[PDB]
Amino acid sequence: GSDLPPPSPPAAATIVLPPNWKTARDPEGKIYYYHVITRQTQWDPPTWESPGDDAS
Numbered sequence: 001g002s003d004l005p006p007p008s009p010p011a012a013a014t015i016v017l018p019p020n021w022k023t024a025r026d027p028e029g030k031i032y033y034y035h036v037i038t039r040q041t042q043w044d045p046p047t048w049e050s051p052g053d054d055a056s
Contacts, residue, residue: 003036004036007034015040018048
């Protein structure tokens, strides 16, 4: 990443997600996000902003 090297995911990661966050994808077609403030990452859990049904 530009700000931070990619993390392995924390359980805490879900708490809050900042617009500051960056994204990266693996060679094996997986795309994920990482939080520069908190040092967190999520590959599967949706962004801070999601539809109404997801209720983020």
